[PDB]
Design a protein around this ligand. Structure first.
Ligand SMILES: [Mn+2]
Ligand SMILES: [Mn+2]
Ligand SMILES: [Mn+2]
Ligand SMILES: [Mn+2]
Ligand SMILES: [Mn+2]
Ligand SMILES: [Mn+2]
Lengths: 314, 314, 314
């Protein structure tokens, strides 16, 4: 199977500049090269260039709506394209607002996909519930069918079509949810495993359940949207919204190895890696290295080791 | 329900000055205010002023016996008082010797209470077994019925009445126990989950059993005495007796969320937070922040999120 | 029962000098003295003096073959000797190549022994599969019966006799395995718990099964070979091959406490502690302290506490 890396150096989804440097930092670590060493074929599509919408006035509270909507429309296009050719899309972010485009484009080709959202945040605020206008805190609101018409249309997102329902998504690692967001996920009956469920069950049982929940009936394409702040600030410090008590490096890796084992990984997002937020060069190195480690993991790298088939090492 | 904060700026229970500053430093973090944001009514009783007993000679090995027994007699009074009014007591300390007063006063009103002691220590040394005269290594000895008469009466503690038996207490997080203390907990058949049991079972199963053990037959008021050193020095460094290999921030929070879910929390102690023992300001900030986080947790704050009832966020 | 400490200040098994200082550093921490405080009788055999083989040319890729084979022949002798006298052998290393001698000698006296290998590496590369000629990446190859004749004889190891088969060994903590090694352990059906299995099962269940696997049928002497890099670099940084995502101090201690409880510990190895690789003195202190802590644990130190029998502390 093929892999196509797509860089999304975008940061208008939030107020801290830096996330646009995420792709550069990930490639600089040898991500693409390290991927070619796996059993997959890799093609690097390079970084999309996002056209900045001049005079992007704030829609009520929402900041940079048009710039965000446009960059996402463009990304959804690219993704739909590579997904059309039967290749696996890997978006390297900027901020989590690019999940809108990433998942939209993917759904066009695989309408029956399910989404595994690894984050410390639900990112489901609607333009009416956000305390800040930041759109990287709203990605899921624009994608849920059940949320259609529950908030005013936003300048630049008219092209978006709610592709997935509350029954197709599972959250893992929640630990920082707004009152609004909590109301929403409780009301819509969305399946989630907050850090408290992970503590109670263990990452093992958590994955076993999300799989029987999303794939119990029909086997379908899996879209993994991974926010790096889903792991504890001790593993991924260089992010815009670090929340203490998060997933461990081991847990993160366990998640990615299980998803690889399902053979259903179709799309992947590596978001929120911000190089400029590291307090020491080492903190940036730590964050990038584990981001790379989680990606290689999605594509076969196991902790028990790997050996090329048909080669007799003796 | 009502919550009443009682500050216990006392430190004679041990040799390191600093713990008196715990209260000051927990309020400074915004705790009281943060508590008012929960579904509880909060009243801050302020900090008790402890009268220093002049010429407090050491009883054999035991240091500052009268001063300690005195500040405890006074605390037990205050606690018994608020407990009588049907409010939940939250003592913010100084050292763990104040658990004597805290639990004594609580028991006067709710004689059938059980105690969940989160510490890395058993704090059950008798005046005859301590290697140091330090009284905050002896709280539980003065409270156990089964230990009555097994040690000399102590100047200042004649007012204390063993209110609980070995069947009403459960230890969680032990990892630094003296030979003497080990003998005692083994001989009296006290239920405990050392770090080794936590490793083996997982915090989930640990809580499940502590509940079926203490509440299996009769549902009773729960008194949670939490020594901040119960968590690993990486989360709560600013304490007088840090022991490596302790509970994690996640596990500490899991404990408190489960106790909140029982609806039986009656009394709470947040002890041993010493601001002067932080090697860097950040270490004090870390310690205080997680102390506050554990308190809010006891009173409702969940990691999956919270939303006010009856408010339609859509 | 008796304990005999044997120092193995050897480092030719790998390229980084420093591991020879491991014993000196473990004793300096008070290891021997702290051991005497346990219910065991301790005799310190001192450090073996290894004769350096001049003109030690590299057998193909393998470096220092004769020096390594000679130091191991000598070690196996010393170990066979103390094992014969019915005492428990504890080897303090240098590098992990000394496990060849350590286990060989042990097997001579207890041919039915099983080996519990705690490492992040399988250390099972054959002289034909190593990318580097380093012999401390090959210990297990020289000890497996199933690997006999699968690689050329090596200058200096003609005295070695494959003593254990693939069904007598269990790996715990693997996370850095070469393609070659992976092929081997998969082909020979060796039982192992990589970090992913530990994540899924929990150290508790992991130990439960390793015991039913190795001791289900016959109870036999246990040889624990512990590579300090088996724990996360955050607990044991001072090693030559740190790999992120390892066992936690708690998990390491759980392992040793369970092995103590079986009453079958016959042989023990504390390897790879390199004092010169610490970035700050504290990192060396951290490493040594936890090495000592795991050793004391093997011989009775429990986290719940310990009290001498027959002494009434009241
Ligand atoms: Mn996000
Ligand atoms: Mn996030
Ligand atoms: Mn205490
Ligand atoms: Mn304590
Ligand atoms: Mn090794
Ligand atoms: Mn190793």
């Amino acid at each position: 199977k093929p892999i196509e890396i797509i860089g999304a150096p975008f940061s208008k989804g939030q107020p801290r500049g830096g996330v646009e440097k995420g792709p550069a930092a990930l490639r600089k670590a040898g991500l693409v090269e390290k991927l070619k060493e796996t059993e997959y074929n890799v093609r690097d599509h390079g970084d999309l260039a996002f056209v900045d919408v001049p005079n992007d006035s704030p829609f009520q509270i929402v900041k940079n709506p048009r710039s965000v909507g446009k960059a996402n429309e463009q990304l959804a296009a690219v993704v739909a394209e590579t997904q059309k050719n039967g290749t696996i899309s890997v978006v390297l972010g900027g901020d989590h607002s690019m999940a809108i485009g990433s998942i939209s484009g993917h759904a066009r080709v695989h309408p029956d996909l399910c989404v595994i959202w690894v984050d410390a945040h639900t990112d489901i605020n609607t333009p009416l519930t956000t305390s800040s206008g930041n759109l990287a805190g709203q990605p899921v609101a624009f994608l849920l069918k059940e949320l259609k018409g529950k908030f005013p249309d936003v300048p630049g997102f008219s092209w978006v079509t709610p592709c997935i329902s509350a029954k197709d998504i599972v959250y893992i690692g929640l630990r920082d949810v707004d009152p609004g967001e909590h109301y929403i996920i409780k009301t819509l009956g969305i399946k989630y495993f907050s850090m408290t469920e992970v503590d109670k069950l263990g990452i093992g049982k958590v994955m076993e359940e999300t799989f029987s929940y999303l794939l119990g009936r029909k086997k379908r394409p899996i879209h993994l949207s991974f926010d790096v702040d889903g792991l504890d600030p001790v593993f991924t410090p260089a992010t815009g919204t670090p929340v203490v008590g998060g997933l461990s490096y081991r847990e993160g890796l366990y998640i990615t190895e299980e998803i690889y084992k399902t053979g259903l990984l179709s799309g992947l997002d590596i978001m929120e890696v911000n190089p400029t937020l590291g307090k020491t060069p080492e903190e940036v190195t730590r964050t990038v290295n584990t981001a790379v480690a989680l990606t290689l993991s999605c594509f076969g790298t196991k902790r028990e080791g790997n050996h090329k088939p048909e080669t007799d090492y003796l």
